[PDB]
Design a binder for this molecule. Structure first.
Ligand SMILES: [Ca+2]
Ligand SMILES: [Ca+2]
Ligand SMILES: [Ca+2]
Ligand SMILES: [Ca+2]
Ligand SMILES: [Ca+2]
Ligand SMILES: [Ca+2]
Ligand SMILES: [Ca+2]
Ligand SMILES: [Ca+2]
Ligand SMILES: [Ca+2]
Ligand SMILES: [Ca+2]
Ligand SMILES: [Ca+2]
Ligand SMILES: [Ca+2]
Ligand SMILES: [Ca+2]
Ligand SMILES: [Ca+2]
Ligand SMILES: [Ca+2]
Ligand SMILES: [Ca+2]
Ligand SMILES: [Ca+2]
Ligand SMILES: [Ca+2]
Ligand code: NA
Ligand code: NA
Ligand code: NA
Lengths: 506, 4
């Protein structure tokens, strides 16, 4: 009786898979049927999704079905191909081959879109659509893809915490009648604030006061043995132009002379003028440190610095600044540094009136002689058997002395170039501030930081106070301060800008 | 000590 041949079925489309586009097309399939009693013209048949397709064997054993519905191949992923053959006698046989293929009607649409914005979705996969009736689908994150009258799909991208442990890739799958699915993957991108540069200005008033000569007198003291106060002499302290007692000495000399203080006024250099908002030397303070028998030294002394101030109509006003010194004539040991005597000046002040304007003269401290730019200190240290000399520096300020010239602001306001943009995350604060052009998140917000001419306190809410500490004589024309600040939003995005302060003199 |  007849002998069966070999039937084989080629791949169903190139990838042996029926996809969502092929679903709606007519698919040709093909194969071969050879051997046994198979012959050209033999019937080939197959049932796919309960539909019957047939053809005949052609020369070379090739068989081909012109058009099988993609929907049938999607519904039926495995089928037999059966060829019916006959031999000489007329005996029949059937030869069976098998075909399997995959079915995947899905398609992906992948997007990377900014949070907190509406976006038209472009380059969607071919055939993408909503099932009829549907005009909106809700995403995994609670976003929405909406179909508009213009045929465009719009995604409302939610705001996300891009710093936490939860993925910010949104998704949704649309399923259609015919079995197709479309998975839209929407990688939500983080938004950020935009810091905008800020401009502020401050002008330091530069008034000139007409003043008389200074008279400096040691007026009181606590403790001490053999204490004497006197007008300076060539041998003890040097001479000055008045009879006030600028010298004070104390102690029972254990080696030679008495310890003490001298103060030579600056009448000659001042030339009868004070300047507002300017560190001024009122004179030269000398500490004369000799060894004296233990216990014999003062522990404090007070000096009155008296002068008159003229107003704009030739009327003089007397002013007395009281200057207080704490003295430590330390026990002498075999350590020179430990044996130094220490003088500490208090930061006292006196307020006066001129032409109805109130001014305060305040002690700044001691400064090294001849160095107007030197550091000003309030304690000085003198070796035994030595004398040290320092300018006694004051500053005259406007008002009651509570503060220096200053200006205020908020770096989130429009300060010349517009207000800082906050982004979609919100919770924006200032997290760094620094003098200069470079800033990172740091530990200076809410602290006082030193600039070139003054100090800045910038707070996390953007509020700032800048006060000018430099003397008027140290502020060149066109002087400016630059402070860089860094803002940061809820999930770490940072932006920096510059607060520039024009520091002028008048 | 004995001196200051
Ligand atoms: Ca395919
Ligand atoms: Ca289609
Ligand atoms: Ca086709
Ligand atoms: Ca045959
Ligand atoms: Ca089947
Ligand atoms: Ca296959
Ligand atoms: Ca997240
Ligand atoms: Ca975010
Ligand atoms: Ca201002
Ligand atoms: Ca004098
Ligand atoms: Ca004198
Ligand atoms: Ca004197
Ligand atoms: Ca001493
Ligand atoms: Ca000492
Ligand atoms: Ca201001
Ligand atoms: Ca700003
Ligand atoms: Ca925050
Ligand atoms: Ca952000
Ligand atoms: Na084949
Ligand atoms: Na296209
Ligand atoms: Na299309």
């Amino acid at each position: 009786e007849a002998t069966a041949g070999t039937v084989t079925v080629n791949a169903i489309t190139s990838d042996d898979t029926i996809d969502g586009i092929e679903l709606g097309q007519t698919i040709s399939i093909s194969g071969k049927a050879v051997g046994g009693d198979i012959s050209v013209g033999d019937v080939v048949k197959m049932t796919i999704n309960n539909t019957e397709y047939s053809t005949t064997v052609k020369a070379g054993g090739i068989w081909m079905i012109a058009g099988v519905l993609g929907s049938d191949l999607a519904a039926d992923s495995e089928f037999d191909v059966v060829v019916t053959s006959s031999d000489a006698a007329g005996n029949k046989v059937q030869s069976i081959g098998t075909s399997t293929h995959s079915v995947d009607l899905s398609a992906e649409a992948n997007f990377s879109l900014a949070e907190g914005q509406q976006h038209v979705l472009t380059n969607l996969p071919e055939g993408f659509g909503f099932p009829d009736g549907t005009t909106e689908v809700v995403t995994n994150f609670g976003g929405t893809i909406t179909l508009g009258d213009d045929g465009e799909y719009r995604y409302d991208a939610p705001v996300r915490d891009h710093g936490d442990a939860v993925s910010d890739k949104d998704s949704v799958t649309v399923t259609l009648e015919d079995g197709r699915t479309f998975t839209v993957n929407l990688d939500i991108q983080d938004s950020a604030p935009v810091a905008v540069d800020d401009q502020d200005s401050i002008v330091v008033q530069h008034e000139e006061f007409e003043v008389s000569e200074i008279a400096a007198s040691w007026v009181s003291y606590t403790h001490g043995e053999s204490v004497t106060t006197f007008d300076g002499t060539s041998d003890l302290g040097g001479v000055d132009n008045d009879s006030a007692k600028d010298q004070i000495r104390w102690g029972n000399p254990a080696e030679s002379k008495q310890s003490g203080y001298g103060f030579i006024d600056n009448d000659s250099n001042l030339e009868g003028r004070f300047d507002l908002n300017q560190d001024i030397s009122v004179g030269t303070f000398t500490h004369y440190n000799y060894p004296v028998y233990s216990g014999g030294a003062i522990t404090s002394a007070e000096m009155s610095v008296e002068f008159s101030v003229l107003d704009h109509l030739g009327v003089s006003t007397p002013v007395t600044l009281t200057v207080n010194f704490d003295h430590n004539e330390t026990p002498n040991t075999n350590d020179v540094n430990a044996s130094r005597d220490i003088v500490t000046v208090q930061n006292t002040h006196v307020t006066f009136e001129r032409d109805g304007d109130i001014y305060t003269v305040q002690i700044v401290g001691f400064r090294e002689v001849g160095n107007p730019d030197g550091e000003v200190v309030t304690s000085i240290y003198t070796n035994e058997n030595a004398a040290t000399s320092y300018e006694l520096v004051v500053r005259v300020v406007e008002g009651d002395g509570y503060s220096l010239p200053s200006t205020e602001g908020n770096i989130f306001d429009d300060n010349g170039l517009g207000a800082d943009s906050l982004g979609a995350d919100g919770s924006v604060t200032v997290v760094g501030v620094a003098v200069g052009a470079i800033v990172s998140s740091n530990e200076s917000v809410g602290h006082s930081i030193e600039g070139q001419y003054g100090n800045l306190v910038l707070n996390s809410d953007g509020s700032y106070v800048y006060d000018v500490t430099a003397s008027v004589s140290d502020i060149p024309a066109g002087a400016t301060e630059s402070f860089a600040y860094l803002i940061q939003d809820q999930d770490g995005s940072t932006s920096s800008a510059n607060l520039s302060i024009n520091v002028g003199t008048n | 000590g004995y001196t200051d």
